[PDB]
Every structure is written in C-alpha cells, then in structure tokens.
Amino acid sequence: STRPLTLSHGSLEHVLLVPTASFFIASQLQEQFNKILPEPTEGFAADDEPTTPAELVGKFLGYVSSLVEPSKVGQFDQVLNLCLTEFENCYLEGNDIHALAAKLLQENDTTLVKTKELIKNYITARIMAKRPFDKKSNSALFRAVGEGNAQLVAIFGGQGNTDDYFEELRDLYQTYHVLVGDLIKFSAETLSELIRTT
Amino acid sequence: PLIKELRSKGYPIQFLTIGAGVPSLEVASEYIETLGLKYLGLKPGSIDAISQVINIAKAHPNFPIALQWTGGRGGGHHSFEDAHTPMLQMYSKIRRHPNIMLIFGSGFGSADDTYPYLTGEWSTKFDYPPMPFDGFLFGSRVMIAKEVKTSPDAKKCIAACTGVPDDKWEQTYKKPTGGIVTVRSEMGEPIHKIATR
Amino acid sequence: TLDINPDDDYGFKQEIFDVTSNGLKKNPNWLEEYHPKLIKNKSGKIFVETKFSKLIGRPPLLVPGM
Amino acid sequence: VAAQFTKVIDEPIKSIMDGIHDGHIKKLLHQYYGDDESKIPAVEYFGGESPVDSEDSAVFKATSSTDEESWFKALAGSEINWRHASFLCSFITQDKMFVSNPIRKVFKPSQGMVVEISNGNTSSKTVVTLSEPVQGELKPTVILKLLKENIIQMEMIENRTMDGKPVSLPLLYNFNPDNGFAPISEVMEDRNQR
Ligand SMILES: Cc1cc2nc3c(=O)[nH]c(=O)nc-3n(C[C@H](O)[C@H](O)[C@H](O)COP(=O)(O)O)c2cc1C
C-alpha cells in the first residue's frame, strides 16, 4: 500500500505514490526539499524554479542524489530507486532523457540551462542508484545501421569554429560529470606529466 | 472579382497565374481562399521574389503553388537575372515546401534542350547534385504555330531570327543579337523585341 | 550540442538516442524524390509523371500567358 | 535564346507540344525503362494527386471527431478506379461547368453515419452503402455503384414516404478516365424528369 506524497512548487505539482514502509524517510525529504527551492514568479521565468512537472521531479532526484554515499548503503537508497521508476514510467516512455529535454524546449517555454540541469539530475541519479547504463538502448539510428538501412561516419572538427571552445568543456564537466569525470581527470594528469617530463 | 464571380457559377478556370511581380502574403491569401482555384501561378524575377513565393506556400501548406521560374533570357518583359544561378542558390529552400510545383522556362524549344532539367543533370555542369524540375513553359517557341493570330509576314520575320546560345543573350542590352534587342517600355521595364527598323 | 533546428535540415544529440521513428530521419536525395517517371492510362496514353502533371492530369508542358 | 528553335512556320500547336512531350518519353524510356513499354506502370486515370502527400468487405463508423481526409481516403481505398475518383476528385463536371463533388458532400462524416463497402477488391462489382438512423432504427440512405461500364449510380433513398415503402432518386454520373483531372461528369439529360 502507497501513500500520496504531492511534490509541489506553487501552481504545478506531481503526485508521488510512496510505499508506506518507507513514507517516514520520503516525508523527511519532502520537507527539506520544499524550503531550499525558491518561491513562484508568475510563469516560472526565474533560473532556479522548475517550469514543468518533469523538471520538478528532476530537481528532486538531484537533491536526493547529493545525500547518497556511492558505496555505503545509506537510509535514502530505496527512496531514490522508486523516484526514478516514477520519473521513467511517467515522463520517459521508454525514450531517452535527451528526447524528453527536446520536447520541453519546443512544446513548453524552458531555457537550455534549465533542461541541461534536468539531464544532469537524471544521469547523476542513475549512477548513485547503482543502476548503470549497460542495456543496449533501442536507438532508432542504430537499429537501422544493424539492418543496413543506414551508414554512419564520425567527423571531428579542429580550431576556427568558436571563440570560447572551453565553455563546451565546462558544460561537459557540469552536466555529464559522472560519465566523463575520470576521462577529464586522466587527461589533466597526462597533460601535467607531459609538461614536467618535456 | 470577375474570376470569383465566374468560378462561383462554375466556369472551368483551373488556375490563375500572376505575371510581373509577386503579391504580399495577405493579398495572395485572398486569391488562394476566396477564388475557387485548383492552383495559383507566381512568376518571380529575383531571389527576393522566390523567397516571397516560399512565404505564400508556408502559409497555405495544402494549397498547390506553381513557381514559374523564368530568367532574363526570355521573350517580352524580362529581368536582368541569369536563369541558372538563382535556382542553384534557392532550389533547396523551394523543395523544403512540398506544395511548390517548380516549373522552368526561358530559352526552350525541343525535348533535347529541356531534357537536362527534367532529368536533373543540368546542375551537374555547375558541380551541384542533380536538381530536377516538375515542368517547362514555352512562350517564344509557340508564336509561329498555325493557330496563333500573328500575321503571316511576322511569322516569316520570326523564323529569320537565328537567335543566340545562353552565354550571349546579355548582348541584347547593347545591340541586335540573333536579330533581337532589349528596349525600355513606357514604365522603364526592359523588353526583348525582334530588331525591326 | 542539444538544441532545436527550426528548418530541420540537420539534427542535434536527440536523434542519436531517440527510440521512436523521429531518430531515423533521412534528408532528401533530390534525384530520387523528383525522378521523372512514365505512366499509362487504361487507353494506353503515356505521360511524363512529375509532381506537376500528377496534379493537372496532362503533360507537364504549359504555354504561358503572352 | 528561344529564337534558335523557331524555324518551321504554321506547324500545328498539337504537333509542336506532342513533339516535345513524345521527345521526353522516347528519352525517358531509353534511360530508365530499357526501351520496353511493358515496364511502364499502368493506372486507370492519371491526375488529381495534390503534391502534399486491400480489404474486401469493410465497415466505417464515423464519430463527431473523425477527420474528413482519413475518412475519404478510407472509402476510396488504395486502387485508382471510379470509387477513388468518386471520393477524392475535388469537383465534377456538369456540361462545361465545375460543380463541387456531390458524392463527397453526401458522405461528409458526422455521428450516426455507417458506411459498408462490399466487393471492395473488384471495382466492377463494388457497392458502397451509407446507413443512418431513421426513426430510431438504422436503414440504408445512399448506394454508390457501377450499372453499365462507365456510369456511376448514386441512389439517394427516402424512407419517410406516404405508404412506408421507400423511394429512390437515381443520380447518374459518367466516369470518363481519359479526362484525368475531372473524370466524373453528371448525366444532365432527364435529370429534372428523374
Ligand atoms: C510575345 C510574348 C508575350 C509575353 N507576354 C507576357 C504577358 O503578357 N505576361 C507575362 O507575365 N509574361 C509574358 N511573356 C513572358 C512569357 O510568359 C514567358 O516568361 C516567356 O515567354 C518564356 O521565355 P521564352 O519566350 O524564351 O520561352 C511574354 C513572352 C513573349 C515572348
């Protein structure tokens, strides 16, 4: 049996069906979360307030992921696993998080920065929940190349393209920290070592 | 008014072509909806006019529009434009909108000379990918037909004009070229006429 | 980049991941879309089939208003 | 430029235009069909396909939502024959005039309407049959079909008569498939008599 826990932010909200065996812990997190986000601003035109039900449960997973130890089986694990499975089955109908993020740009009025946040929150969560990406995703483009109805080529640019390339590296480190973090960090160690030896 | 009135009685007016310019969105909108026409014809001169045709087509995406493309090398009132260059620039944007039936004209006569445009392989010359057209228009070519009212002696006068390949049409601003010259009308528009005395 | 092309000429990341048929989008090869074709009637009259003749039901040649 | 092809005086306009059109067929056959007319796909009538876009016994129940185009596409079916022309052909021909398609107006979908198509995979014998509510109980009201080989009968039925027995108005149309653009034309002899 599940107890309705209304994650809300002024106007809009999302009804989360929490198993009553773990309502004690989830009501705790409803409280803490509900103060830290700001107050509504008529159409949600500010840069810390979610403009859709989807972003709201995004913000939530973000908060909950920050409180989890990635080794230690902490108090807030079984909460996170069941906030994802709500997020997946409601807003993410088999499709990937990036598809969702696109819908939200053209249908609603969310900014880029707002939906990169949503992307981070989901992807961060999945790794903190010990539910990694090991499934061969049924991406259309790759079902097609498997069959022979597509041929792919990868191309890599060089210089001349942008004034500040480095903001592209910044935006990679923020948003995909959990996937790329150890490559960025192995890069720097390698470059630092290459300076000292040269 | 006369078309609306005639179309409402059921007179067989399949289409209306608007020569010499392209209407504004709100006038074309009136011509599309209000008149009982299967399709509208537009004859743009410049790249800017080809854009104004695309905007009419975006705004009524179920209605067929025949973009009748004619270069400066055509008979009667003519633009200054090449026939090829503007198409190579715009063909891609025209084909985005699938209610534009894209029709070439200016300089055609036989099958042989117009086949490259049907096949698409005309744009292979200028190292673009093949780029084919939906139909052709023949003005000049048809003016010595049996059933046109053009006077027996003016048909002899036409047949005597040798004419000139595409590369040389632009000499008609200076002097007779294939027995043909440009000449300002009362408005100041150019016109290609047979260089009689 | 993630973003939205209005003209839909090219795609962004979405396409790589998308699972629906909005992931496999093909740009038009003009030579194949607008290939001219032949077609017959019951009466065995051959036509040149283009986007334009398909509509008007007559050959894709027109005499303009002179 | 066009002056280098103007050479033959008083050539009939048929012979010029046919000369170009046949010249294309000649060339298009040799490239893409290997000089073989058998490989040209045949249709009944060629025309009236806006540039924007196999079940025998079917039944279509219109609701107050049903989209008109989805609805008319379904009745016409896939094959290009009289039924295709009957339901998609934008208008028809009376003498020389071009009246809105009546067959399309009658079958314009609204709640309660029920079409049944019998022998849909053999045009010769096909019979579309609209049924509506008439005094609670649901009865046939319209019947499209072929009589003779190029006549479309659209029997419009009245069920509310003097003596209960129903009364039919046979509206006849010619189907001429050599006029691809408007292949349907109303038979106007004795129309007012009928
Ligand atoms: C004698 C003559 C009269 C024309 N009259 C008109 C006209 O009244 N309105 C118009 O829009 N175009 C007119 N045009 C242009 C044709 O419609 C068309 O653009 C041109 O004939 C095609 O070029 P071509 O003559 O080289 O085949 C005329 C062309 C000629 C040769």
Swiss-Prot record, chain B:
The modification Phosphothreonine is found at residue 70. [Alpha(6)beta(6)] hexamers of two multifunctional subunits (alpha and beta). Fatty acid synthetase catalyzes the formation of long-chain fatty acids from acetyl-CoA, malonyl-CoA and NADPH. The beta subunit contains domains for: [acyl-carrier-protein] acetyltransferase and malonyltransferase, S-acyl fatty acid synthase thioesterase, enoyl-[acyl-carrier-protein] reductase, and 3-hydroxypalmitoyl-[acyl-carrier-protein] dehydratase. Present with 91800 molecules/cell in log phase SD medium. Belongs to the fungal fatty acid synthetase subunit beta family. This is Fatty acid synthase subunit beta. The lineage of its organism: Eukaryota, Fungi, Dikarya, Ascomycota, Saccharomycotina. The gene is FAS1.
UniProtKB/Swiss-Prot annotation, chain C:
It comes from the Eukaryota. Signal peptide: none annotated. Coiled coil: none annotated. Fatty acid synthetase catalyzes the formation of long-chain fatty acids from acetyl-CoA, malonyl-CoA and NADPH. The beta subunit contains domains for: [acyl-carrier-protein] acetyltransferase and malonyltransferase, S-acyl fatty acid synthase thioesterase, enoyl-[acyl-carrier-protein] reductase, and 3-hydroxypalmitoyl-[acyl-carrier-protein] dehydratase. [Alpha(6)beta(6)] hexamers of two multifunctional subunits (alpha and beta). Present with 91800 molecules/cell in log phase SD medium. Belongs to the fungal fatty acid synthetase subunit beta family. This is Fatty acid synthase subunit beta. It comes from Saccharomyces cerevisiae (strain ATCC 204508 / S288c).
